Amino acid sequence: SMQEEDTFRELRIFLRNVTHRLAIDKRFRVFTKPVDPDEVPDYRTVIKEPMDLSSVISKIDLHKYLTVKDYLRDIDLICSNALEYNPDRDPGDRLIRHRACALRDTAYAIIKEELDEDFEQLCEEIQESR
């Protein structure tokens, strides 16, 4: 229906706004663009599904997310990729992991305060119905 297409448009507006707030935070700069294969040729052989905040913006616009749960699977994949690729005790690795965990916890906290649970339940029921 028209009403269902209006529900999914509101979902996209909400997701662009959360993603822009993460992307301007100086802590999360390393997560804003894909890894350059020239700089890190080993990256694409270790990490099977790369993900970053520029790709998440592109996926919102392509209508890839029908629920906030779909969207948070990609935020969780940005975080898990960083913990897998950078697992060592040295400071460079410990700083990337700390920032990855902060990206994940910040996205979950914005959504806890600002997403209405009945708006998410509506998105999930339209998705199920298709």
Ligand SMILES: O=C(C1CC1)N1CCN(c2ccc(F)cc2)CC1
């Ligand atoms: O996991 C990531 C970020 C996507 C989250 N990276 C770890 C490895 N970094 C790197 C850069 C130059 C270099 F010569 C070797 C490694 C780039 C940043």
